[PDB]
Design a protein around this motif. Structure first.
Motif, short mmCIF file in Angstrom:
data_model
loop_
_atom_site.label_atom_id
_atom_site.label_comp_id
_atom_site.label_asym_id
_atom_site.label_seq_id
_atom_site.Cartn_x
_atom_site.Cartn_y
_atom_site.Cartn_z
N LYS A 2 0.83 -1.20 0.00
CA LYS A 2 0.00 0.00 0.00
C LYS A 2 0.87 1.25 0.00
N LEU A 3 0.34 2.35 -0.52
CA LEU A 3 1.12 3.57 -0.59
C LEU A 3 1.78 3.95 0.73
N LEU A 4 0.99 4.01 1.80
CA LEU A 4 1.52 4.39 3.11
C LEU A 4 2.78 3.63 3.54
N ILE A 6 5.40 2.77 1.52
CA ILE A 6 6.63 3.15 0.83
C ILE A 6 6.98 4.62 0.98
N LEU A 7 6.01 5.43 1.38
CA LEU A 7 6.30 6.84 1.59
C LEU A 7 7.09 6.85 2.90
N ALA A 8 7.88 7.90 3.11
CA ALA A 8 8.67 8.01 4.33
C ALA A 8 8.81 9.48 4.64
N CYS A 9 9.17 9.78 5.88
CA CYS A 9 9.32 11.16 6.30
C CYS A 9 10.48 11.84 5.57
N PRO A 10 10.24 13.04 5.02
CA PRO A 10 11.27 13.80 4.30
C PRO A 10 12.43 14.20 5.21
N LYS A 13 13.06 10.17 7.47
CA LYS A 13 12.96 8.92 6.71
C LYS A 13 12.14 7.89 7.49
N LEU A 25 -0.34 13.51 7.24
CA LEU A 25 0.47 12.29 7.29
C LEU A 25 1.35 12.57 8.50
N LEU B 18 -1.23 2.98 -7.83
CA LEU B 18 0.17 2.68 -7.59
C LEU B 18 0.59 1.81 -8.77
N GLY B 39 10.74 7.77 -0.94
CA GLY B 39 9.56 7.90 -0.11
C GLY B 39 8.70 9.14 -0.32
N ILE B 40 8.99 9.93 -1.34
CA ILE B 40 8.19 11.13 -1.60
C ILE B 40 7.55 11.09 -2.98
#
Lengths: 60, 64
Positions: A2-4, A6-10, A13, A25, B18, B39-40
């Motif tokens: 799911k998307l959530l 693979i995204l990470a904090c800028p 991280k 988020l 996705l 991650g962005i």
């Protein structure tokens, strides 16, 4: 996958969680909340909201 | 509910999917794929990949 996941904090991280009101988020890893505006997660420290004390504590 | 239900293409405001290799958020409504970098999800047209002819066609399930 799911998307959530693979995204990470800028900034740190770290993992992100969809806020309860689902407008941000949350990055506990950084004490920050990135805003979701116009359907885009706005990943900028400049736009992020500093998590309140209660938000940083662990409910546990 | 899931994140993909809340996010919209910044250009056409249509749904986003996705990609297969999970490295892009494709916007069929705009014919673009936004890259996910470290991650962005960089969702600017200037940074996107335009969908190929095959990607823009309708997914054909059965034979003809």
């Amino acid at each position: 996958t799911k998307l959530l996941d693979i995204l990470a904090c800028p900034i740190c991280k770290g993992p992100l969680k969809l806020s309860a009101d689902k407008t941000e988020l949350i990055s506990k890893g950084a004490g920050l909340a990135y805003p979701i505006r116009d359907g885009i997660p706005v990943m900028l420290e400049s736009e992020a909201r500093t998590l309140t004390t209660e938000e940083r504590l662990d409910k546990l």
